[PDB]
């Protein structure tokens with residue numbers, strides 16, 4: 699697909715389903731700041747401060763959390779969801795956002811939050827662009 703211009707992501711949340719002890723708050727902060735700079739540079743600025751950033755465990759936590767987000771944050775544009783490898787959490791996130799609450803979500807692997815590369819950040823930006831782009 700081609701790149702879309704005129705996306706700005708102002709209202710967004712992080713849900714971290716990776717354990718804190720593996721993916722710590724400095725990991726999250728760091729990853730978010732790198733994401734902030736590459737997306738800005740590509741013309742699709744995601745604001746550096748998510749409206750929400752919490753850790754959760756289990757697919758059972760997903761639906762309560764997302765209903766929480768929907769009910770708390772007007773204008774919420776995106777949930778970025780951090781996953782510890784392979785996990786039923788992925789399917790549940792997609793179930794709830796895609797088919798129940800109509801919430802855009804973008805999943806990301808814990809290893810790519812612990813240690814970012816330009817290429818994986820780009821991959822993410824490109825996926826975000828497609829989702830929030832309107833074409």
Ligand SMILES: Nc1ncnc2c1ncn2[C@@H]1O[C@H](COP(=O)(O)OP(=O)(O)OP(=O)(O)O)[C@@H](O)[C@H]1O
Nearest residue numbers: 781783784785786788789792803804805806807825
């Ligand atoms: N079964 C799974 N368990 C854990 N993580 C997964 C699983 N399937 C995919 N992922 C992770 O989700 C990330 C991308 O999720 P994303 O939100 O982009 O899905 P999607 O946009 O619905 O995919 P598609 O573009 O094919 O529809 C990838 O980095 C991948 O590692």
